[PDB]
Amino acid sequence: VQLVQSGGEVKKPGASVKVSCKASGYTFTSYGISWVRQAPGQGLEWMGWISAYNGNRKYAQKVQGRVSMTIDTHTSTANMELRSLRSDDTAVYYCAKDRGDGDYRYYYYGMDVWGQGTTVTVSSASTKGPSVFPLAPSSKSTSGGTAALGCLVKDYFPEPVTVSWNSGALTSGVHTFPAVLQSSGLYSLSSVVTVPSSSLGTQTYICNVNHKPSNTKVDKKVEPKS
Amino acid sequence: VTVDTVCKRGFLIQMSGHLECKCENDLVLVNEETCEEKVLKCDEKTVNKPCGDFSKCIKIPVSYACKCNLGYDMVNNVCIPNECKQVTCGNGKCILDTSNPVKTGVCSCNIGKVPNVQDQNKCSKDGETKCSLKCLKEQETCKAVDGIYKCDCK
Amino acid sequence: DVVMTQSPLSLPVTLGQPASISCRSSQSLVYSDGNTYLSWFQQRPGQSPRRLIYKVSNRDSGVPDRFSGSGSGTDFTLKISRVEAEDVGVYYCMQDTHWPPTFGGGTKVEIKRTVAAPSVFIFPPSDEQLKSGTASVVCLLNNFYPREAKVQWKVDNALQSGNSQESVTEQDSKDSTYSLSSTLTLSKADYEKHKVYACEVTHQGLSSPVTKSFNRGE
């Protein structure tokens, strides 16, 4: 029993997005499909419902003027099209199996099966690779034999970037933080590692940054300050 | 309730092991095949009227309350057969076993499930149920929705 | 719309100990058919929600016995009888008695550990970045517990507002701590107009606030 959603999308404000949801392992047309979204860091929010049994549909008030839900019974697929997108539509969108009869309750309780989610990002930004700047270790980032160093990965779009240290051979004490979305609409994140301060003269520390959407790879040696 | 039953102000539905009447709109069962309008408050003006499936407002200082019909018990705000009180079925519901002269709760399952002999006969085994409904209207046929069969437009 | 309020927001637990999450609705969830349409969902990190409980107290197939649900009317409880490591994640209640279906705001189950003070480090902007017209100053709070910490930037003793952003890691799998990064972003020209850059940290693990600061250009 499973619901398989279409892949992630990036859209400009004012565009529309169509997310699909294919059912298998149960009789799709005996049931319906609810859509639920979750903005980054936030809780779950119900968007609407459509019956695959009879086509009736109901939309949440927040989206009712710009959402369209449809069924393709031939391919056991439910679609949700959200129109005139805005930045606060950025979210993961889930489909979930739900009631097919919106007028009567029997002995079936909905939302029992969920798809894997579809990320939708809405932004006027264009795809752009990051700039990578060293966060050099110094006396201001050194605490009793331990030094912190890092890389600031600034101004890229869309997510994600991946960061490793010394080509993945340095993992202890690495913290790669969640990206934040800047006022410019570009993302920024930092990755830091703590190391023995005695190792600053014996080891090279390189952060490896990869931004696949822009085919940008950067290696940045982080040199210590004396 | 059989395939030949006509539910008054309701419609037949079928599960893996039984048929029952479902009431239209917000009516309630006054017996196994008859639905009537429900009162919202039990008091002097609404005494004897139905207040829920198999329960009516009765008189018991003076006061009025919603009470299950003989043979039923109030469980989680619903009147269910006495012998179903401690039964849990999973993907279905408890009904009285019509084959057993001694009233005994057994599971009847959502369409696509059947009693699972590996799981104390709860509704956890996949299995098919043939629709038996006689859908009188030429434009209607038996349809599966939300774990039941019912008559609906073709 | 029915408001679903969950508590607590964050639930630190000890592996092997019971835990319980509360869900309260702004109106009765008993429907006109006598049933109460209240459900509980588990969302493990990076995954879809999974239903655990429906109709208040019924466990979904494949859900361990240690999960149970109870309550009535407007007041509901999800109980975990012995928390296992795999139970960390966010739990949501949901009502669909009243249209539209609405969710509680979520409860994050995390691993409880002893209080740990942050180690605080500050990084001036790099010369490379300054070459480009922008200056980012980064303050790191490393390996602390509990998750909540207050960070304030001061530039020449003036409190900054609206020009910093922060982000916090997930709870570490080895040691159950958190780390936080705060970035203060100024134009190079504004950065050059001030001397002392400081981040001030308050945390349960410090009896007095800790300040890390540098002088531009030292």
Residue numbers in the entry:
A (entry chain D): 2 to 52, 52A, 53 to 82, 82A, 82B, 82C, 83 to 100, 100A, ...
B (entry chain E): 3 to 62, 66 to 159
C (entry chain C): 1 to 27, 27A, 27B, 27C, 27D, 27E, 28 to 213
Verbatim from the authors:
Pfs25 is important for ookinete survival in the protease-rich mosquito midgut, assists with penetration of the mosquito epithelium, and aids maturation of ookinetes into oocysts. Comparison of the structures of Pfs25 in each complex to the previously determined Pvs25 structure 13 showed that Pfs25 adopts a similar overall structure as Pvs25, in which four distinct EGF-like domains assume a triangular arrangement and disulfide-bonding patterns are conserved.
We obtained the structures of four site 1a antibodies, 1190, 1262, 1269, and 1276, in complex with Pfs25 to 2.4, 2.7, 2.5, and 2.2 Å resolution, respectively; and two site 2 antibodies, 1245 and 1260, in complex with Pfs25 to 1.9 and 3.3 Å resolution, respectively. Site 2 mAbs 1245 (plasmablast-derived from Kymouse F-87-3G) and 1260 (memory B cell-derived from Kymouse F-87-3b) are examples of convergent selection in two different Kymice, and share 84 and 96% sequence identity in the variable regions of their H- and L-chains, respectively. Interestingly, our crystal structures reveal that none of the differing amino acids contact Pfs25 with their sidechains. 1245 and 1260 demonstrated a smaller interaction site compared to site 1a mAbs, with BSAs of 803.1 Å2 and 847.6 Å2, respectively. The smaller interface likely contributed to their lower binding affinities. Their interactions with Pfs25 were predominantly mediated by their HCDR3, which contributed eight out of the total 14 H-bond partners for 1245, and seven out of the total 12 H-bond partners for 1260. Notably, the LCDR3 of these antibodies did not contact Pfs25. In contrast and somewhat surprisingly, site 2 mAbs 1245 and 1260 apparently displayed no SHM that led to additional contacts with Pfs25.
